[PDB]
């Protein structure tokens, strides 16, 4: 990829004594730049990942390069540890083992074995936007290499600590424009839309009487939102497009997955039932509408489903929803002629969530993505399968939310 | 046979629930409740209705965009 050589053009200039951040998309080969930089400097490189599936993705790039199972490219884990070598080591570590606190499982001594024998030379950090934290400063203070590098896809955070990375790791060097890279390889053309569903009069007066996190239980469970969700579900099946429904709330995810008759992936779900839906989503065509919480988006992003629906949205994390929504669009690449990646947001009128959802769409204009407004699509008035459309079901939904507010 | 002099204010039912909140606080606002889209407001407070209704939407929407 030419933008990787543009990212590598700064490394070939001065050669020695440099440290910066390179912004590359998730669908782009961001792991390929760390391989060529490891073949240029040739030193003990420690990879700073966060998940075990992030360790296995970097080990496949070592097989594509040169050796991994030898006594050089180690693999730092809390279950087992491997051996490294001098000036030729490619080890991947974990944040919950190198930093830690006191919980050691006979692997903390192995984690400090490469940070005390001068086995460094290159620092590669995965996702630099999470380094604005607290335990990340303990990782940088225990290492002292010659050159550093940070790889990420997004850095928009309102925690007011993203500007601290210019002296900790280094300033940003190459920021590639995502609309320009969408013309290189079509990484799903984004259509940001927000369905302006109306608010019923019974749920509006009960919305103002509730505050805190209990008031979101009346916004998501709005009766016209189920008329807006079931209309967009049946609309995408007529076009032959799979749907991935996002929700920040675990209980609100189950309420939209049980009434629509779809499987769900939520918090503390067993992995035998979690992987069974993925075999019914990637192979079976009957499951084109999945319901995922916050576990099925930060672990594995699906390159299918060109229609995304956001229902439950949390305040504050509107930049965290933008990091989640961006990884789905970067995973969707195959360079199609159309490739219309529709994004919808069922925002009810005069609720406190739609005014924070405008902060989420404002981040997408900064990425170059186009945002449009859709009040109502002319077709939801002809769907008799819309639940909570009749005034009897709206009062039955009102009593279930009023029973929900008494429990919370 | 009886014609009382008020002020007909036609609006949506979501705004209508906000007009009744003004009568629940400062009072002497809504004289009669007609239907789901119409109310009977006192004629001496119609300009006070339009000024107070813009304040509550400015606090509900906010959005500094900065």
φ/ψ of residue A314, rounded to 5: -105, 150
Helix, strand, or coil (residue B39):
strand
Helix, strand, or coil (residue B31):
strand
Report the candidate in A97, A114, A94 with the shortest Cα–Cα distance to residue A43.
Answer: A114
Contact B17 A355 (CB under 8 A): no
Resolution in A: 6.7
Residue of A158, A196, A201, A209 to mutate when probing chain B, most B C-beta within 10 A: A201
| Residues whose CB falls within 8 Å of the CB of residue A157, separated by 6 or more in sequence, listed in order | A129, A132, A319, A320
Half-sphere exposure of A169 (CA within 13 A, CB side): 32
Task: State how far the Cα of A266 lies from the Cα of A296, in Å rounded to an integer.
Answer: 8
Task: State how far the Cα of A52 lies from the Cα of A40, in Å rounded to an integer.
Answer: 27
Among B60, B62, B63, whose Cβ lies nearest the Cβ of A350? B60
- Tell whether residue A217 is among the known ligand binding residues: no
**Does A315 reach chain B within 8 Å, measured CB to CB?**
no
**Does B65 reach chain A within 8 Å, measured CB to CB?**
yes
Task: State how far the Cα of A392 lies from the Cα of A395, in Å rounded to an integer.
Answer: 5
Contact A358 B63 (CB under 8 A): yes
Helix, strand, or coil (residue B33):
coil
φ/ψ of residue A292, rounded to 5: -120, 140
Residues in chain A: 408
A304 CB burial (10 A radius; 0-12, 13-18, 19+): middle
| Residues whose CB falls within 8 Å of the CB of residue A88, separated by 6 or more in sequence, listed in order | A42, A43, A44, A72
Task: State how far the Cα of A152 lies from the Cα of A50, in Å rounded to an integer.
Answer: 13
Helix, strand, or coil (residue B14):
helix
**Way it was determined:** cryo-EM
Q: Output the CA–CA distances (angstroms, integers) from residue A346 to A113, A158, A234, A407, in the order listed.
A: 52, 24, 15, 25
Residue of B11, B21, B56, B61 to mutate when probing chain A, most A C-beta within 10 A: B61
Given a contact cutoff of 8 angstroms between Cβ atoms, the answer to whether A343 and A193 are in contact is yes
Q: Show residues of chain A in contact with B16, CB under 8 Å.
A: 201
Helix, strand, or coil (residue B60):
helix
Q: The domain containing residue B30 runs over which residues? A: 1-66
Number of domains in chain B: 1
- Tell whether residue A289 is among the known ligand binding residues: no
- Strand A243-247 relative to strand A172-175: parallel, antiparallel, unpaired? unpaired
Q: How many Cβ atoms from other residues are within 10 Å of residue A334's Cβ?
A: 11
The one-character DSSP state at B45 is G
Q: Show residues of chain B in contact with A223, CB under 8 Å.
A: none
- Tell whether residue A26 is among the known ligand binding residues: yes
Contact A362 B65 (CB under 8 A): yes
- How distant is the Cα of B63 from the closest Cα of chain A, in angstroms? 6
Partnered with residue A197 across adjacent β-strands are A348
Residue A191, Cα to own-chain centre: how many angstroms? 18
**3-state SS, one letter per residue, for chain A:** CHHHHHHHCCHHHHCCCCEEEEECCCCCCHHHHHHHHHHHHCCEEEEEECCHHHHHHHHHHHHHCCCCCCCCCCCCCCCCCCCCCCCCCEEEEEHHHHCCCCCCCCCHHHHCCCCCCCCCEEEEEECHHHCCCCCHHHHHCCCCCCEEEEEECCCCCCCCCHHHHHHHCCCEEEECCHHHHHHHCCCCEEEECCEEECCCHHHHHHHHCCCCCCCHHHHHCCHHHHHHHHHHHHHHHHCCCCEEEEECCHHHHHHHHHCCCCCEECCCCCHHHHHHHHHHHCCCCCCCEEEECCHHHHCCCCCCCCEEEEEECCCCCHHHHHHHHHHHHHHCCCCCCCCEEEEEEEEECCCHHHHHHHHHHHHHHHCCCCECCECCCCCHHHCCCCCCCCHHHHHHHHHHHHHHHHHC
Q: Output the CA–CA distances (angstroms, integers) from residue A87 to A20, A90, A166, A391, in the order listed.
A: 21, 10, 27, 73
And the tokens for B8?
């007909």
- How distant is the Cα of A352 from the closest Cα of chain B, in angstroms? 7
Nearest 10 degrees: Cα torsion A395, A400, A401, A403? 120
Task: State how far the Cα of A156 lies from the Cα of A320, in Å rounded to an integer.
Answer: 8
**Does A349 reach chain B within 8 Å, measured CB to CB?**
yes
């Amino acid at each position: 990829r030419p933008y990787q050589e543009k990212s590598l053009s700064k490394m070939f200039g001065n050669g020695r004594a440099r440290s910066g951040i390179i912004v590359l998309p998730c669908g782009a080969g961001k792991t390929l730049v760390g391989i060529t930089a490891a073949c240029t400097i040739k030193k003990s490189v420690i990879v700073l990942c966060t998940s075990s599936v992030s360790v296995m993705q970097w080990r496949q790039q070592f097989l594509x390069x040169x050796x991994x199972x030898x006594x050089x490219x180690x693999x730092x884990x809390x279950x087992x540890x491997x051996x490294x070598x001098x000036x030729x080591x490619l080890v991947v570590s974990t944040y919950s083992m190198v930093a830690n606190x006191x919980x050691x499982x006979x692997x903390x001594x192995x984690x400090x074995x490469x940070x005390x024998x001068x086995x460094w030379g290159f620092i590669i950090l995965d996702e630099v936007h999470v380094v604005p934290a607290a335990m990340f400063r303990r990782v940088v203070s225990t290492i002292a290499a010659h050159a550093k590098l940070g790889l990420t896809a997004t850095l928009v955070r309102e925690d007011d600590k993203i500007g601290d990375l210019n002296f900790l790791i280094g300033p940003k060097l190459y920021e590639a424009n995502w609309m320009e890279l969408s013309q290189k390889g079509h990484i799903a053309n984004v259509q940001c839309a927000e369905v302006w569903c109306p608010m019923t009069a019974e749920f509006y007066q009960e919305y103002l009487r509730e505050t805190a996190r209990k008031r979101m239980l009346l916004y998501i469970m709005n009766p016209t939102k189920f008329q807006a969700c079931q209309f967009l579900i049946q609309y995408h099946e007529r076009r032959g497009d799979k749907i991935i429904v996002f929700s920040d709330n675990v209980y609100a995810l189950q309420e939209y997955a049980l009434k629509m008759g779809k499987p769900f992936i939520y918090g503390s779900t067993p992995q035998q039932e979690r992987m069974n839906i993925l075999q019914n989503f990637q192979y079976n065509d009957q499951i084109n509408t999945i319901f995922l919480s916050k576990v099925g988006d930060t672990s594995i992003d699906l390159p299918e489903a060109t229609c995304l629906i956001q229902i439950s949205s949390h305040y504050g994390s509107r930049r965290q929803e933008a990091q989640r929504l961006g990884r789905i669009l970067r995973a969707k690449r195959r360079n199609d002629e159309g490739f219309n990646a529709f994004f919808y947001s069922l925002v009810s009128k005069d609720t406190q969530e739609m005014y924070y959802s405008t902060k989420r769409q404002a981040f997408l204009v900064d990425q170059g993505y186009a945002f449009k407004v859709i009040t109502h699509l002319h077709g939801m008035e002809n769907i008799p399968n819309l639940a909570y459309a009749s005034p009897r079901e709206r009062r039955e939904l009102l009593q279930e939310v009023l029973l929900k507010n008494e429990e919370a | 046979a009886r014609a009382r002099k008020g002020a007909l204010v036609q609006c949506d039912p979501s705004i209508k629930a906000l007009i009744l909140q003004i009568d629940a606080k400062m009072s002497d606002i809504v004289l009669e409740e007609l239907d789901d889209t119409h109310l009977l407001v006192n004629p001496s407070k119609v300009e006070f209705v339009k000024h107070e209704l813009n304040r509550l939407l400015s606090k509900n929407i906010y959005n500094p965009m900065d």
